[PDB]
Structure 1
Amino acid sequence: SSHHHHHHMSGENLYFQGASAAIVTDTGGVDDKSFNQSAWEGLQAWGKEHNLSKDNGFTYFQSTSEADYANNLQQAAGSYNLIFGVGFALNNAVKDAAKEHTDLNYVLIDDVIKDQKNVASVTFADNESGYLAGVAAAKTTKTKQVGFVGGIESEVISRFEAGFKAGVASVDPSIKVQVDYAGSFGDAAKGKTIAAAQYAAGADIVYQVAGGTGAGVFAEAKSLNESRPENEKVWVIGVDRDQEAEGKYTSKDGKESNFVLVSTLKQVGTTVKDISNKAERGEFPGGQVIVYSLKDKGVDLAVTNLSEEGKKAVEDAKAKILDGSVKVPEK
């Protein structure tokens, strides 16, 4: 109302104290074209906004196995006071690191840690984006058979799968969805052999929800499409980032096309940047669970090469998810 007892602080004497933010990466690595890459692009963009550079305010520690998680988190505790665990698999290692370093702030992406004041948890309604990918897939299949390549069987990938199946069923319940899991988010060779088998069995669209394993699914679709006419091409649905640029190829009949139908978006980078800004301002949301869904555009579908009929069905499906008229299952 009033502030009679006040003192003027000159701008020459004022500063904002900065934070140092690091990501600890899951198996996919910062070149997975999807989940970990999104996180890394977000941290780089945060670093740029704060006039920082790699290993001078921000960096990444790549994990190659589960045993690496703890070592990477402990290494990050040396110079960083905001540390991101990028992947549900990092749950336990983040819990342990947050308990040993109560003075530092920790974020878990894709799962929830309870009753830890220095931990924030971020989840995405990947069922809702998956549903839209399913509607898109059902509106473009000619063979009436589509493929789903998961990374690791889990609550997280089951949301994608359950949403995708439900979305396909909402358009045409007669469509067959072949489901196979690679058992890794960093095994490209397994992605290629699963995609090869799913296409050979009559899938004309594969949705790859497997991080870096998905590079094999792109490689398989490129090989098939290179040795075929453009009108006989087979589709891939992108994940986490808009992957349209990865679907470019030249057909057998010399035509240049794109085999990316649509991409589910998961704004991991945007979350990294937004929470890093909250941490620097001393407003770190410790103990909170942050839920991103279709409503807040934390997940979305990039429509890319979908037919106008498909786009209308997507917009109708999206509107019904926001309305509450359609409840997308999580299992």
Structure 2
Amino acid sequence: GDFVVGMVTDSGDIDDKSFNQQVWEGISRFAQENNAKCKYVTASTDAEYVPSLSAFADENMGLVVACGSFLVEAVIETSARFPKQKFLVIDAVVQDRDNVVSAVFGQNEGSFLVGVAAALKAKEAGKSAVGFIVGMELGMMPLFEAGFEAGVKAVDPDIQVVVEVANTFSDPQKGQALAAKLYDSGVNVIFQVAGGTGNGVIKEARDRRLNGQDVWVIGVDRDQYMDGVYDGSKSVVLTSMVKRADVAAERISKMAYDGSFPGGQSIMFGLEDKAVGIPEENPNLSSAVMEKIRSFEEKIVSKEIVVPVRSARMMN
């Protein structure tokens, strides 16, 4: 009865205020605007990955969307079994499948920009360390730390980045504990790249500011400024590393619907497509800080500066 897009995620939550929420929102917009339909399913454990993709393929969906590095192995296999079914992989790469499109993001380039903002706010308070909390480090996740460190060092090579890994994208309690550990050490800015877990990092920052501690958090995926309002007016969110997975999902769903699915291609959504970067409006960033950030953004887009894909501590 309708062209249908089906989303399979490893997360039990599409309202994570971040990544899964952006993907579902993009699929939802495509459906609403094109008189089509959509649905999703959660694959909590990997024993569910293959059967979940298979069921959708068995219903002859217009497009099957798989989110994240965890589902890659299952997509690689399943796409070969259903050569006529179109699949879209977000946040990972699949090769040798003419029925699969891989959407990847230049998140190292966008993270460079919030690294500049972080280093400037830290210097403002005489701090020589900033924090970074990441959900997991598999797949393309290391790009966030690589770019964040690069942006911080571009401002002041002496500022250290202190890293904490949660090893989960769905545990806010853990996010809060790791944020408390970093803030208790004297850090005043933390960039969180942790999906649902990250909501706990934002909560901890809100609680600290409420009681007079001059701390900040940088959000991810969505513009999380409102998520950080703690006293009715002010927000603890300095800025956010926005990642338009919604645009990717919506646009590729439309290509599938129209017959122009770019099967077998990896499409990079980067800083020049405005697919990653910071929000257009930033109440907590001064015009001077904004100028510095846009200056760097221009050099990255022109390739005058190339942002690494792995941080110093992860390189030989």
- TM-score w.r.t. length of structure 1: 0.88
2:301 corresponds to: 322
1:91 corresponds to: 72
Q: Secondary structure at the match of 1:74?
A: helix
- Number of equivalent positions: 304
State the AA in 1 paired with 2:120. Answer: K
Quote the Cα distance in structure 1 between the aligned partners of 2:184 and 2:46.
34
Query: In the alignment, is residue 68 of structure 1 matched against residue 60 of structure 2?
Result: no
Quote the Cα distance in structure 2 between the aligned partners of 1:294 and 1:81.
29
State the AA in 2 paired with 1:199. Answer: Y
Q: Is the 8 A contact 2:66 2:75 kept in 1?
A: yes
Quote the Cα distance in structure 2 between the aligned partners of 1:70 and 1:179.
34
State the AA in 2 paired with 1:138. Answer: A
State the AA in 2 paired with 1:219. Answer: K
Give CA-to-partner distance per residue, 1:47-99, whole Å, 9 cap, x none.
110224xxxx2111123223332232123224323001111111101112212
User: What root-mean-square deviation, in Å, do the aligned CA atoms of Structure 1 and Structure 2 show?
Assistant: 1.6
1:189 corresponds to: 173
| Worse-matched range after superposition: 71-80 or 163-172 | 71-80
Q: Secondary structure at the match of 1:285?
A: coil
Query: In the alignment, is residue 152 of structure 1 matched against residue 152 of structure 2?
Result: no
Quote the Cα distance in structure 1 between the aligned partners of 2:69 and 2:237.
27
1:215 corresponds to: 199
Query: In the alignment, is residue 297 of structure 1 matched against residue 274 of structure 2?
Result: yes
Q: Secondary structure at the match of 2:230?
A: strand
Q: Is the 8 A contact 1:69 1:90 kept in 2?
A: yes
Quote the Cα distance in structure 1 between the aligned partners of 2:295 and 2:132.
23
* 1:124 to partner: Cα distance: 0.5
Quote the Cα distance in structure 2 between the aligned partners of 1:150 and 1:263.
14
Quote the Cα distance in structure 1 between the aligned partners of 2:109 and 2:210.
33
Q: Secondary structure at the match of 2:278?
A: strand
Query: In the alignment, is residue 133 of structure 1 matched against residue 114 of structure 2?
Result: yes
Q: Is the 8 A contact 1:108 1:122 kept in 2?
A: yes
* 1:28 to partner: Cα distance: 6.4
Q: Secondary structure at the match of 1:99?
A: helix
Unaligned 5+ segments in structure 2 are 311-316
Query: In the alignment, is residue 82 of structure 1 matched against residue 63 of structure 2?
Result: yes
1:4 corresponds to: none
Give CA-to-partner distance per residue, 1:12-40, whole Å, 9 cap, x none.
xxxxx963111112326211111110001
Unaligned 5+ segments in structure 1 are 1-16
| Worse-matched range after superposition: 153-162 or 204-213 | 153-162
2:314 corresponds to: none
Query: In the alignment, is residue 306 of structure 1 matched against residue 285 of structure 2?
Result: yes
Equivalent position to 2:214, from 224, 227, 233: 233
Equivalent position to 1:37, from 6, 11, 21: 21
State the AA in 2 paired with 1:315. Answer: R
Q: Secondary structure at the match of 1:274?
A: helix
Query: In the alignment, is residue 202 of structure 1 matched against residue 186 of structure 2?
Result: yes
Quote the Cα distance in structure 1 between the aligned partners of 2:106 and 2:247.
15
Quote the Cα distance in structure 2 between the aligned partners of 1:200 and 1:72.
43
State the AA in 1 paired with 2:229. Answer: K
Q: Secondary structure at the match of 2:234?
A: strand
Q: Secondary structure at the match of 1:180?
A: strand
Equivalent position to 1:261, from 232, 238, 245: 238
Q: Is the 8 A contact 1:139 1:309 kept in 2?
A: no
1:280 corresponds to: 257
